[PDB]
Amino acid sequence: PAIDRLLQIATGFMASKVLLVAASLGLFTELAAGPLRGEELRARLRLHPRSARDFFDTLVALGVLERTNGAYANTPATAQYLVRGKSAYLGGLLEMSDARMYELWGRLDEGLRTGNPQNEIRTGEDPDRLDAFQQAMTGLSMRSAHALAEAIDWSAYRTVADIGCAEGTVLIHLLERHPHLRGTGFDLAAVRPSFQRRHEESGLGDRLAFRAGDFFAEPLPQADALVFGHILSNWALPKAKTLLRKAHEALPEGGIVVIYETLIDDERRENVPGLLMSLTMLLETPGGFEYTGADCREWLADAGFRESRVQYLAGPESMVIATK
Amino acid sequence: PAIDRLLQIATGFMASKVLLVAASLGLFTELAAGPLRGEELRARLRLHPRSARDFFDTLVALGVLERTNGAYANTPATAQYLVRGKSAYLGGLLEMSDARMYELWGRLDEGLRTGNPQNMTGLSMRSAHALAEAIDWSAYRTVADIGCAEGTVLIHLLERHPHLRGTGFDLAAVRPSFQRRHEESGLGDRLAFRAGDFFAEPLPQADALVFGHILSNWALPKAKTLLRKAHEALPEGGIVVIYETLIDDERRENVPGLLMSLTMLLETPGGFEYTGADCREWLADAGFRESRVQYLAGPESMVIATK
Ligand SMILES: [Cl-]
C-alpha cells in the first residue's frame, strides 16, 4: 500500500543513522583485510556488548554487510567505496552527514518557519573528517567531470575556464580527456594551494593555469567555454544574474556557458534530489536556492545568450548549456 | 548499482524529516477539506515564503501530495491515514518521531559505545484487530492483558468476543486513561482494571495472558520472571500470548525488528528485541508445554504457548 511506503520513508532516519554511524566508526575499514567475528569487531570499535551484535546484524539486514558462520564482512559496495585509504573512498560523505547534516536537518521546521539558515550562520560561527569529506566531494565531482567530457563536443573549443573551480577536479579531468584543451581555474586566492597540488599531480603543466579572483568583484577570464558547477545555486537570484552577464562578456561569438546543478525537473514534480537540495540551500545559505533548467534558460535569455538547452549529466546532476 | 542504493539509505534522513515536519505541521489535515493553493497553504501553516513552495513540491515529488494548476491536495493515503481526529489516523508515529525520536536516534553512537539509554492510539489498532482474529478465543472465558496501558487492545478483544471477561493490569497511574476508554466502550462489568507492578506481585489469573510489547522493554532475567509468573497465573490448557516486532530467527533480514532493538537501547536500560526461537526457549524453560510463532500483522509476530 501507499501508506506503508509513506511510513517507511517517514521513519527512514533510523536506517540512515545506522549507516552514518557505521561510517563514522570506520566499521567497513576494520573489515577491509578480511572477516571479523562480532566480538572482535566490537572490541576494535570499542563498542559496548549490549547492542553491538544488534548493530552489526542491522547492517546485514540492510544489505551493507555479509555474515557467514558468525563472521562479518564487507559487501562489494562497502569494500569498494567505504574503506578508508582507497582512492574510491566515499565514506567521507557519510561521516560529515553523521557529524553535521543529520542535526542540521533536525532544524528543518525552524528553517521553514523563518526562511533563515540553521547552520553555523545561526550560531554565529575534526580535520581528518573534513579531509575525508573533501575526498568524497572530489569523487562526486569526478563523476560529473567524466560525463561532462563526453556530453559536449569539446573539439569545437580551444580554451575553457572553470569559475569557482575549487581544487580543479573537473577542469583537470576535462583536460586529461581532451589534450587539445587549455584550461584556467578561477577561484579565491586561498584555493590556489589545493588546486596547484592537483595540477602538479596531473602533470598537465602549462596546459592548466590558476587565476585568483573574486567573481563578484572582477571580470571573468576569457575562454571559449565557461563552466559554473554548483555556483549559481549558492546565491540569491540578482547575484546569479551578474555572473551570467560576466559570462556573456567573457565569451567569444560561438562560445558556450555550461551551468550544472542538482536541477529540479521543469514541472517541479519528479526530481527528489533537486528538491531536497533546495531545502539544503535553505538550511545552509542566506539566499541560495535550487532551480529548474527552464528557470535558467530564462535568465540566460535575459543575459543575451543566443540559444540554450537542458541536458542530463550524471547521477543527480544536470546542466544548462547556452551559446553566445 | 549497490553503492547508489547504499547512499540513498544513508541520506534517507532528509526525506524522512520532510515527511516528519509535514506531520508535525498538520499539513495533511489542512488539506482535508479540499485542495489549497500554495500561498493559502503557506499562510495557514505560517511558513516563510522563501522555501514553502520547495517544501510542498518535495512532498509532491515524494508521492505524498498531489498538485495540479498550483493547487495541492492529499493523496488517498494521506487523506485516509494522515488527517488528525480520525480513528484511522497513523500520523501519531510521525509526530512522535519528529518531536522525540529523530533527535534520540541522533545519539545512536553514544548508545552503542556505552550501552546506556540516551533519553498514538491508532498505532496499536492493526495488531489489536489481528490478535482478535488470529486466536480461537471461543476456547477461553477470561483474559488478562499484562501492561494494558489505556486498554485499547483488550477493549477491542472484548468487543469482538462478547463471551470474554477481561482484566487490564498496569501501574495504578494508568487507571484514569484506562477508565476513559473503558467508559467509552460500554463494556461495563465485563472489563476491569487491576493496579499492580508485575515485578512485585503475582499476575491476575485468567485463561489467557497477553504480553503486547512488554518483554522487549526489560532485561532478559526480568522477561523470564514475567514468563514464570504467567505460567503460575494460568490454568491447565491456558495460553500465554506474546507479540512483538520480532527479529527473524537467523537475525539477518528483519529490519523493523533490528531497528526496534536499537530503539530499545536508546530508550531503556535493559530492553531488547528478540527472535521467535529465543522466546520459545524461554517459554520452554518457564514450563510451557508447547509453543509456536506466527506472523500476526505485517512486522508484528506473536508467540503462543500452552500451559
Ligand atoms: Cl563472536
Author numbering:
A (entry chain B): 12 to 136, 146 to 344
B (entry chain A): 12 to 130, 157 to 344
The authors write:
Among bisindoles, reductasporine is distinct due to its dimethylpyrrolinium structure. Its previously reported biosynthetic gene cluster encodes two unique tailoring enzymes, the imine reductase RedE and the dimethyltransferase RedM, which were shown to produce reductasporine from a common bisindole intermediate in recombinant E. coli. RedM is a homodimeric protein with monomers consisting of a largely α-helical N-terminal domain (α1-10, β1-3) and a Rossmann-like fold C-terminal domain (α12–16, β4-10) bridged by a long interdomain α-helix (α11). The C-terminal domain possesses a Rossmann-like fold typical of Class I SAM-dependent methyltransferases, with a β-sheet of five parallel strands terminated with two antiparallel strands each interspersed with α-helices.
The homodimers of both unliganded-RedM and RedM-SAH structures superpose well on each other (rmsdCα = 0.175 Å, 553 Cα) and comparatively poorly upon the RedM-SAM homodimer (rmsdCα = 1.244 Å, 593 Cα) due to a substantial displacement of the C-terminal Rossmann-like SAM-binding domain. The two domains of each monomer are separated by a gap of ∼12 amino acids between residues ∼132 and ∼144 ahead of the long interdomain α-helix (α11), which lacks clear electron density in each structure.
